[PDB]
Amino acid sequence: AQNGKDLLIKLDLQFETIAGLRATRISFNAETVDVTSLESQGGWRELLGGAGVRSASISGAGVFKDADTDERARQIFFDGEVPEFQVIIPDFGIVQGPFMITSIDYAGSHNGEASYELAMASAGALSFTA
Amino acid sequence: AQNGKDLLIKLDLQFETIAGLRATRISFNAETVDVTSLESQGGWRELLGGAGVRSASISGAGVFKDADTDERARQIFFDGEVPEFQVIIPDFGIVQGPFMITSIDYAGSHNGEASYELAMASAGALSFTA
Amino acid sequence: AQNGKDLLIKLDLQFETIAGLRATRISFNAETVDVTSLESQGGWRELLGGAGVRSASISGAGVFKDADTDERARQIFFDGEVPEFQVIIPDFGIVQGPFMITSIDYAGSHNGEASYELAMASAGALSFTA
Amino acid sequence: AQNGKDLLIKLDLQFETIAGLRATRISFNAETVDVTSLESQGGWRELLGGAGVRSASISGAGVFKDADTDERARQIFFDGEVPEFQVIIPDFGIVQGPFMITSIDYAGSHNGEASYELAMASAGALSFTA
Amino acid sequence: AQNGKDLLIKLDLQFETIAGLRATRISFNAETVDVTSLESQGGWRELLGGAGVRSASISGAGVFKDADTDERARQIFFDGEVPEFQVIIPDFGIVQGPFMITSIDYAGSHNGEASYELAMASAGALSFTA
Amino acid sequence: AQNGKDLLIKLDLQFETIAGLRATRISFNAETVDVTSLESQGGWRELLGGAGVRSASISGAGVFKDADTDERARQIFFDGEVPEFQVIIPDFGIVQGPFMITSIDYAGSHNGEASYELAMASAGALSFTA
Amino acid sequence: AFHEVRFPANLSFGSVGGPERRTEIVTLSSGHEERNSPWAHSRRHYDAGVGLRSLDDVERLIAFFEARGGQLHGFRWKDWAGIVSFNEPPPQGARVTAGFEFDVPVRFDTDRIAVSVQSFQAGDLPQVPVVEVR
Amino acid sequence: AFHEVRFPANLSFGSVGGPERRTEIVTLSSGHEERNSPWAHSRRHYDAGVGLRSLDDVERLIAFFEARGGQLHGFRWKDWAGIVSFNEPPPQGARVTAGFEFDVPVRFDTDRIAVSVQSFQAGDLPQVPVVEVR
Amino acid sequence: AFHEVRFPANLSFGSVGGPERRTEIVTLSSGHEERNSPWAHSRRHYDAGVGLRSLDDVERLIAFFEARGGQLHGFRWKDWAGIVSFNEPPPQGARVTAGFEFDVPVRFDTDRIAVSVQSFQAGDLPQVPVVEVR
Amino acid sequence: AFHEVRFPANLSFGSVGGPERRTEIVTLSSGHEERNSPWAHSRRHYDAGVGLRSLDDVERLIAFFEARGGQLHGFRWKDWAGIVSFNEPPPQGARVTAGFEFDVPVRFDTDRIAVSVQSFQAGDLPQVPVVEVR
Amino acid sequence: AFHEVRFPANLSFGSVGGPERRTEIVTLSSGHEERNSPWAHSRRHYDAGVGLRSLDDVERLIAFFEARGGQLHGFRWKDWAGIVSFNEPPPQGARVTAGFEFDVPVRFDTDRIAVSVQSFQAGDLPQVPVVEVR
Amino acid sequence: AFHEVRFPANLSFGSVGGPERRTEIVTLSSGHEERNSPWAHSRRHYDAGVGLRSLDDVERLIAFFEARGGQLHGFRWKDWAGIVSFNEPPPQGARVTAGFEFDVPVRFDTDRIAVSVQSFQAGDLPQVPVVEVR
């Protein structure tokens, strides 16, 4: 078993995690390049595999606590960059990829928190430190 | 931690917040201009970053209490303008952007409130007072 | 604070509210005419404002109690008209607009009520009595 | 107030209601023929009204109890007809329209009922008996 | 009233019901061939009726208990056939139609059952034994 | 009855199941090649059957426990392959098909687990060991 | 030329047609130009009729083209749009009606028709352009 | 010219076709018109047939074009739409039937056909136009 | 040429039109060019008007083409875009207005019009191009 | 003319082709007309082949056009649709097979081919029309 | 030829244009072929400009075509893409700039323009192709 | 003719191109055919290149057409698909490579190019066809 407190996204400025990090989710994708020739041993769909583009997307939720890493993401959004982002998996290790800052949003209610979602997507080739 | 009571949207007439402000949510966006050349070190999707257009959208919910700032939004809607709007983030600061008044709606039930949603979207270049 | 019992939609025949008026919701709209020139101080989306068409839509729910104002809406639907409709906001005032009777529906169950939704949409220029 | 037990859909064979009639809902429609000329006193959307086509749709739910009126609907579906259907509104009166039998479905579970939905739509000019 | 335990789908091999049959639902359809001429006594939509194609779809849920009728459906899927299927309605009777085996799926969790959905659709002319 | 703990997906490296396997679901499909000629004994839709392509899709959920079979799936994703995958049905038997690794995603919250979904789809002709 | 019937009642939404003017024109490359027309009327030139009913209506419609049609006969046409004048200008329309009450005798602008079957009973044909020959 | 068979049973929704005429026309430019018809009959001119079944039906369909077809033979055609008259006008159709009961002998209007494979067993071909040569 | 009315009030979003020139041009193939203008003016050339109202508006619109139209008359045209000059360059527009206040007398660029029925009372016609003959 | 290989195995769904007949035709403007064909066979005329595999398959496919292809060589073609006869009419097909078992030697109907790259490994080419020259 | 202004600031995403070369060519049917160009420059040939602002911007834009435009005047053009050289090859661009800082004097490739109204204040025109005449 | 560089690295998915032949053909109308090939080689004929990067990449790409391009120079082309032979038939390719390792010297098949702006920094151009002149 692995603690959900262990997997951490973190910005550059040298890497530090953001403050409100209530729920985060790295999500990989591939578009499944269908190569269905007429011949196929039972009429099954055949796929190519390595031809497909592959992606990554980070969706971080949290409560707005002011930190320099939280101010950094605003500066990354206004001065639109694609810097290095890094996401630990507990016992796998970090990812250390270039991402962008696709859509952030700050929210607040009459009774609750200052909360924020932070949605990111892949911008380059990723890595894995094991 | 930051109180959700602190982040406030406010109209011009000089800036004052609207009356029913039950839940508000500034939401930024970028359309992620995909620049996927054939070469890419693992077949990863490459992105450009700064070429993407960037936006902002404000969705304010609340209960209809009559105020001059609430009458102002009706006047902003009928006399369709794009005036300056300003949204505080608790410890970041204000935004102070030109927005429009995209869709408002007043609602009431047989037993509940006179409530209203107020949806806005970006209309110009934004700012940040830190 | 304003009572939800105060905001009332009402038909002409001279104006009277309909009988079952469990939940009602005037909803305004504008389609946000995007005017995004290549120049924009941060690549922000620019909008025009007053060029957009603007609308209104009324969705009234309620329980079927037979009234002359309830029979009127059936007559407005079969003899398809666009008469004047009027919706009070508690402390704002009335709207007094021409609407049509876009879609109504009567419903009943084996144990519950004769209930009805009544959906309307804008048909002309609206007003505001303050 | 009007009892939901009072509003009744009924088939021809002379008119009799179907057996399982757990929830029924006549639903009228009009497609809102938009006539938006360039001139309009505030840029409001103008509508024509009577040019729009108008419809009716009946969605009857219930539990499968075998009746001749329930067998009739199967015969109406296989021998595809558009016979007269009649729906009472409690204190308005009947509708007495030609409908078709657009989609029916019988359902059953390992523990529950033999249940059925019965969806109908308008097929001609309707009426109203007051 | 009719027991939901009574309505049963069943395969050929001579007809036997499948093992896990937690929830089943035959669903008929017709696409409603719109014949809307310009003339119509109130501008109502006119429909043709018998010109529409008509269909049937069976969605059977259940828990994977190994039976020869459950192995049969796998053999019907891999050796893609359209054999006769038969669905009782409690007091109506059977249907006895040719269907195909459109999409099946086996599912299991870390704590629950081996469960399966079994989705079928019409493949020919149906019947009714009364 | 069959235990949901029994049906197991498993990777090659020789076959071993993955660690977090909270909920898994093999799902087969066929696209239902509609062959609706004008003649049909009641206007029923006719289908061909064996002409349709047929597919399989595996959606495995689980909690991230580090295993060599869990590291294998990352290596299968980055070095994009279509290796043999094998899914037991309790009393049917294995499937033993070539699949790809279409979309995986790792997720973690501020309080919960390191969890992951693992979505696969068919890549070749499948089998059945009985 | 006949006086046989109007038409099958059904006409789909899209039955287009409006007056056609010879309008012989010179188009001087300098600038403004003069023009004249020899009609003193206007061929109404209705197009895009569609029959949509059951197949029982089709056999009385395909031979509508054939039997009283051929090519060269009247079949007075019903307009969803004895002398009628148009007084909304200070000029006048003053256009005659040889037939009574908007019945505008025509002929189809087709060497062939093309009826389609869309379902067990659906009969469709996409267009029957006319021009109201006098 | 043959009397061989109707056709494969399958025909998709959209098998269009209707009678033709030459009826050449002068359109007298300053008034009405006058127009001549040399036919007294009509070519029925059916188009847009589609075969859609398994590949077992295809090999009896591709050689339908070939074996009894060639180019110049009958293969009597079935209409989903011995003398038949049309009495819905006071005029008459009075159009003959050389073959019995709407069987309209034709020929395909193609130098080639084009059968497609849509799936492991799906056979499709988009069009086979005919004109009903006598 | 008339001075009759502007137009029906309704104009759909998309009523396009802008000035023309002949300005014939030689494009000297081995360098720059030289080009002549014989106009000193511009045909405003408005296009793509659409009438969209009830069928009560249609009969005053179809005879707008007919009654005061014919082909060869004015019907002064309203622009949603006595001498007007344009001073935003140091050059000048200095373009005359024979009619008052942007009223640009025109003529329709059509031998026929084509009004459509879209619903029980919807009247549409897609285009009425004009060129503003002097 | 070669006997080299069938083809790459892959063919996409949509590989169209059917017999093409000279069908020299006179089309008498009176009515019925005569016709004759000088083949006594039928060019099978297969089109719309698509290669879809990895880029390892592409270099053995682009030089399939080049090396044994050029333009003017056989490369016996596999049909997914020694004398074969067609007996479903009382007429006969009786069409010869110079090659064994549906192998129909052809040539591509292209001066050039056009292979595309759709992803790191995807190789596509949209069409290779043949005509089965004897 | 003027030095009047750049342009209205607004240009939509899609303002296309790139250098156009005479490239007189012989295309020998044998194989390789020779070619030469007489420019020693390249017409930049910008196209597809779009004005999109309020109707207040339109009347200063329609007479931009008219007043200082006509057809045959400069109106120096702003490129979103004194001698500039291009040194990324060992060859050189060495292309002159008669105007300062990418201002490329042009002319519109249109006899007319076509401004549309899309809403109470929206002014659009789809294209203004230029070619930068020297 | 140059030996300057390959190209900008970026090429979009869809860069199509394959060898050509003239191979003129007579199609003897009453039997098979006979056809001649004068090439013994093939023009590789690559098309549909697309540059997609920032605007920093555009100014080194528009003058790629201009500076070392002009019209009549090499710019060796990179294929994502010293003598290379093709041995998968018992025939042979045996096609020469004047440049090393699939570098196929070409020229652009354009009088002009057309670079577009898609966003604040997006530069696109849809096509740059080539034919590989020797």
Residue numbers in the entry:
A (entry chain B), B (entry chain A), C (entry chain B), D (entry chain A), E (entry chain B), F (entry chain A): 3 to 15, 20 to 136
G (entry chain D), H (entry chain C), I (entry chain C), J (entry chain D), K (entry chain D), L (entry chain C): 2 to 82, 157 to 209
Structure paper excerpt:
Gene transfer agents (GTAs) are DNA-containing phage-like particles produced by some species of bacteria and archaea. The genes encoding proteins that form Rhodobacter capsulatus GTA particles (RcGTA) are derived from phage DNA, which has been integrated into the bacterial genome. Particles of RcGTA have heads with a diameter of 38-nm and 49-nm long tails.
The structures of the stopper, tail terminator and tail tube proteins have been determined to a resolution of 3.6 Å, and that of the distal tail protein to 4.0 Å. The attachment of distal tail proteins to tail tube proteins is enabled by the long loop of the tail tube protein, which interacts with the β2-core α-helix loop and short loop of the distal tail protein. The insertion domain of the distal tail protein was resolved to a resolution of 5 Å and can adopt several conformations, as seen in two-dimensional class averages of RcGTA tails. Therefore, it is possible that the insertion domain enables the binding of RcGTA particles to a sugar receptor at the cell surface of R. capsulatus, and flexibility of the domain may facilitate binding. Attachment of the RcGTA baseplate to the tail is enabled by the binding of the attachment domain of the hub protein and central domain of the megatron protein to the N-terminal Ala2, long loops, and C-terminal Arg209 of the distal tail proteins. The mismatch between the six-fold symmetry of the tail and threefold symmetry of the baseplate is resolved by the different conformations of residues from the long loops of odd and even subunits of distal tail proteins, which enable them to interact with hub and megatron proteins, respectively.
